[PDB]
Structure 1
Amino acid sequence: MNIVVLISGNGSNLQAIIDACKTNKIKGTVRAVFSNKADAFGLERARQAGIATHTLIASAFDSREAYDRALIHEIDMYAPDVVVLAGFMRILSPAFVSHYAGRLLNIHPSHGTSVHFVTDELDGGPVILQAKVPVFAGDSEDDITARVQTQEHAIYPLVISWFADGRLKMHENAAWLDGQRLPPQGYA
């Protein structure tokens, strides 16, 4: 099970995925990490784990089209069974979304988190799993995030493990776990 992760920043979600794989909680291997931001910290986490990295800068190409074609060609050299977006800030082309249909995931910082199968250009599509984070009087916005971030590091690797296992699929713009079509709110 080949996993390719796309990032734009820090890479803390990427790290949680790397760790879940290292402990075999995810029956898969992160084969490469792609960044559209030069020197994103996540590239460093990938290097530290001995994973190949590639950076593609928009200003380095003639157009969005040229960029998207190069990104797809490069990702494809790694034969991904799953392409996971973890903080990848670029608006995707319909062609990219179509090319990875059924194997493109995204984690959404929305208080709660949710991971979806991406079926549109803004990283949207059917919800697979989501959780809620409670707030309390006294909570600092940086207390909220930390809780949310902790939550993301927990559910993304879990959802990816379902995929790596053959248990999770996308059909009719819906998510199916163990052959059961999940409801709009994901697995409950």
Structure 2
Amino acid sequence: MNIVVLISGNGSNLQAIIDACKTNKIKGTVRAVFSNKADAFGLERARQAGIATHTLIASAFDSREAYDRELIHEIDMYAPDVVVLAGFMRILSPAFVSHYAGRLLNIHPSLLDEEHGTSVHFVTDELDGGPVILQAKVPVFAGDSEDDITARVQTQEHAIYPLVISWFADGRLKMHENAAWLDGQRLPPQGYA
């Protein structure tokens, strides 16, 4: 499976993807990693694991169209079967999303008083919408810090973002007709339960 990741920062996520591929949990390989921030520590994790990296920075291009054209150019160069977004702070164009749609995945620290957890989903439009594959929820106990919450979530992401990519890996996930479908069965807007 030719997995390309996009990032904008730490790479903790990128990381678990990477490991799961080295442990052959995900039956794929991360071929390139792209960042849109030059000092993104995740770049370093990529270099450490010998994965090639490219960094396009908007200031370097004179229209977000030119930026996307270039980005879609360098990405396709690796022939991705999946394009994972593991913390890419960027406003996606129509054209970019279409170009990848069905292969484009992205994860939120949220599920879509206040409960916490992550949601993994097929991106389907430029406002970051589309079929949830899997929502997971994180408890908050009496007296944890914002940081404790944030960790729990972080951990959760590491636990499911891999896994949803394994389902795509073994051909168990496919999105069509704007719905995510795992094993033939269409999933409700909450994802697999």
After TM superposition, is the score higher than 0.5?
Answer: yes
CA distance, structure 1, for counterparts of residue 140 and residue 178 of structure 2: 32
Structure 1's unaligned 5+ residue stretches are none
Map of 1:184 onto structure 2: 189
Deviation by residue 1:79-99 (Cα, 9 ceiling, x = unmatched): 000000000000010000100
Query: Separation in 2 of the partners of 1:170 and 1:63?
Result: 31
Name the CA distance, whole Å, in 1 between partners of 2:56 and 2:22.
Answer: 27
Give the whole-Å Cα distance in 1 for the aligned partners of 2:190 and 2:104.
18
Q: Deviations over 1:40-96 (max 9, x none)?
A: 000000000000000000000011010000000000000000000000000010000
Q: CA deviation at 1:101?
A: 1.0
Query: Shift of residue 100 of structure 1?
Result: 0.3
Cα drift, residue 187 of structure 1: 0.4
TM-score (norm 2): 0.96
Q: Secondary structure at the match of 1:88?
A: coil
Q: Distance in 1 between matches of 2:105 and 2:159?
A: 15
What is the Cα deviation at residue 122 of structure 1? 3.0
Classify the secondary structure of the residue corresponding to 1:5: strand
Give the unaligned 5+ runs of structure 2: 111-115
The structural deviation recorded for 1:120 is 1.3
Tell me, in whole angstroms, the C-alpha distance in 1 between the residues paired with 2:49 and 2:89: 23
Over residues 103-155 of structure 1, what are the superposed CA-to-partner deviations in whole Å (9 max), with x where a residue is unaligned?
Answer: 00001110110100000113221100010000011110000000000000000
- Aligned CA-pair RMSD: 0.6
Taking the aligned partners of 1:29 and 1:103, their CA distance within structure 2 comes to 15
Supply the distance in 1 between the matched residues of 2:118 and 2:174 (Cα, whole angstroms): 20
Matches of 1:161 and 1:132, distance apart in 2: 20
Look up the match of 1:121. Answer: 126
Task: Give the TM-score normalised by structure 1.
Answer: 0.99
State the number of aligned residues: 188
